[PDB]
Amino acid sequence: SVPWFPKKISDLDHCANRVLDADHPGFKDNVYRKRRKYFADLAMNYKHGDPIPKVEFTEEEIKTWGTVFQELNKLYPTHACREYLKNLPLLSKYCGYREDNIPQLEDVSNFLKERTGFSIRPVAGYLSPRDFLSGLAFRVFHCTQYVRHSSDPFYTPEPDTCHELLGHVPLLAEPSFAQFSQEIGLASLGASEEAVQKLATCYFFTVEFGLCKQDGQLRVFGAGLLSSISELKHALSGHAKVKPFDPKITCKQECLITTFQDVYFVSESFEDAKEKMREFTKTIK
Ligand SMILES: O=c1[nH]c(=O)n(C2CC2)c2nc(Cc3nc4ccccc4[nH]3)n(Cc3ccccc3)c12
Ligand SMILES: [Fe+3]
């Protein structure tokens, strides 16, 4: 029968806590060790209704952010979709997006709440697909608060806060994107294991690695691209395989992690991607 799923936004307290390795940069770092523990604990003890704890980031952490931030910002005008470019300066103004400042999740959450009703919840680590997607049903983005190791600013084995803030947040501020995202979460609620994996894959090739066509040009809206200097350039380089976004086809595609994607999917628009998902979710309900 139907598995447990959240019925209200505070119900995410019951799944968001259901979560390093030696190959990771920073395994070797005792200070980074304690820091990550500190971030994980903040997420574990967060309960819905709490202000998200404000963090004093270290100078090393801010420098790492600045390095990623600076290089990525050179590429956004020519690579990011128009919605991304529209919202990014608003975040600069209202949430302190600067090369020399890491935005606080609480500010970003308040900004999004007034823009689309989206909000942030710090998450200690990787959640099951089901739990992660369930947050979106209440317009809750489960969001990492830690920073990648300073040794390698340009690669992270995992979503860190830099990826969340530069990759995800600007589009969550966009009504059409937020509707699309929430509908993925809503479709997942209490769905079968198979449906959840299918929805997770569609989410992956849209929210995380999606491309869209705007005024005849391919642009990027996927968060994983927008926080990855290499793959951002590669995705629009012309040497990449591209297919039309089509849920029944896209949900079969394998989600690669330790490498560039084999293929990227192109949505006509967020509205259209939304309409296709709606048609698709009917066949998996
Ligand atoms: O917890 C998740 N569970 C899941 O099942 N999915 C998949 C989509 C259903 C997730 N996805 C993302 C965010 C995310 N952003 C990424 C960017 C590039 C590669 C992987 C990414 N995962 N997270 C958050 C997260 C937080 C800490 C460590 C790993 C992942 C999850
Ligand atoms: Fe992500």
The SS3 of residue 214 is: strand
Q: How was this structure determined?
A: X-ray
Q: Which residues of 147-183 are buried (b: 16+ CB within 10 A; e: fewer)?
A: bbbbeebeebbebbbbbbbbbbbbbbbbebbbebbbb
User: Please, is 87 exposed, middle or buried when counting C-beta atoms within 10 Å of its C-beta (0-12, 13-18, 19+)?
Assistant: buried
**Which sequence positions are flagged as catalytic?**
163, 168, 208, 227
Q: How far apart are CA 25 and CA 152, in angstroms?
A: 8
Query: Which residues surround the ion ligand 2 when the cut-off is CB under 5 Å?
Result: 159, 223
Q: What ligand is nearest to the CA atom of residue 228? A: 1
Is 184:277 a contact under the CB 8 Å cutoff? Answer: yes
Nearest CA to ligand 1 atom 22: 159
Gap from CA of 125 to ligand 1 centroid (Å): 9
| SS3 of residue 44 by DSSP | helix
Beta bridge partners of 243: 265
Q: Which residues contact 109 (CB under 8 A, 6 or more apart)?
A: 52, 119, 120
Pairing of strands 217-220, 140-143: unpaired
List C-alpha distances in Å: 262 to 2, 94, 198, 228, 235: 35, 37, 18, 16, 10
Q: Please name which ligand lies nearest the alpha carbon of 204.
A: 1
| From 17, 196, 208, 250, mutation site for ligand 1 pocket: most ligand atoms within 8 A of C-beta | 208
Number of H helices, E strands in the chain: 13, 6
Identity of the amino acid at 178 = A
Joined together, the tokens standing for residue 173 give: 């501020």
**Taking a C-beta distance cutoff of 8 angstroms, is the pair 133, 185 a contact?**
yes
Residue pair 143/122 in contact by the 8 Å Cβ criterion: yes
Domain range annotation of the chain:
1-285
- Resolution, rounded to a tenth of an Å? 1.9
Q: 68 Cβ partners below 8 Å, 6+ apart?
A: 148, 153, 154, 162, 166, 227, 229
Q: Which residues contact ligand 1 via a Cβ below 6 A?
A: 123, 125-129, 132-133, 142, 144, 158-159, 163, 200, 203-204, 208, 223-224, 257
Residue 110: C-alpha distances to residues 38, 117, 121 (Å): 23, 9, 12
For the chain, strand residue ranges (E) read 119-122, 140-143, 211-214, 217-220, 242-244, 264-267
Residue 100 sits at φ, ψ, to 5 deg, of -105, 20
Indicate the burial class of 241 (C-beta count within 10 angstroms; 0-12, 13-18, 19 or more). Answer: exposed
Residue nearest to atom 7 of ligand 1 (CA): 129
